[PDB]
Amino acid sequence: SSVPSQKTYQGSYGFRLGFLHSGTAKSVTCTYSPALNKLFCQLAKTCPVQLWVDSTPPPGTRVRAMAIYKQSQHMTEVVRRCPHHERCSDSDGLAPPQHLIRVEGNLRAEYLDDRNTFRHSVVVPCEPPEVGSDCTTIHYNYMCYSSCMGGMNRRPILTIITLEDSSGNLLGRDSFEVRVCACPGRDRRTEEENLRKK
Ligand SMILES: [Zn+2]
Structure with a gap:
């Protein structure tokens, strides 16, 4: 599949994301690393993302x-839930079971399967x-682990957030890497230390 753009673009309205400062304690369920531009979160837990x-x-x-795969050798593959999680009957009544990213607590959320790229x-x-x-x-949920076999299978992903007009035309764009994992605080600490050592 062709690859959606990930270029940061503030546009006419000065659009950009923001993230809370949640720290890296072992018990944290969602934490954002500015140094890595990377969100670390537990499976299906609330991820607050600010819009500015x-x-x-x-x-x-x-x-x-x-979501798209970050590595160039995988970017053309549709990011989807793995063969287990797409069948685990955790529907919220709105999100298709194949979709990795859900919006929590918004009855006006709409889910698209693109008829040409097949991306969600x-x-x-x-x-x-x-x-x-x-x-x-906006409160997002990620519905598979980065490690899920038959799905992301340890490959890093990006989330692309687009501000759109009522026709779907681009007004603004921002993005961040995501790792869905059991211990986001430890993993953020490890990856930040790895970056420093580099
Ligand atoms: Zn899975």
Whole structure:
């Protein structure tokens, strides 16, 4: 399959992501490394991702998430749940069981199987921050481990977040690597130390 762009693009509205500072304790379930631009999270646990803009986008703007393989030798392969997890009957009533990325707690989430690339994505309406908040947060879930045999099978992935108009045209783009693993805090510490030693 052709490869969706991963180029960072703030666009007219100054679109970019933000992440909490969750630390690296052994018990943490989701933690983001700015040094690696990499999110580490446990299977099916809440991943808060912030959306920031410098100016207000139009009504009907949407926010799409899609996963691709990071390594060039795998980027053309569709990222999907493994043969076990696609059959484990953990449906939330909305997400197709094949989709790796879900949006949690948003009844307006829509799930796309692209008729040409076969790639999966989940899209929600863009919403302004709640009163008293400075940004909007989407809660994502990743529904397979990076290690799942027959699926990601240890290959690193990226999540691409696109801000879109009501037709699906590009308004902004950002991205981050993801590792879905049992101990995100330890793995973040290990990978950050590996980077320093490099
Ligand atoms: Zn799996």
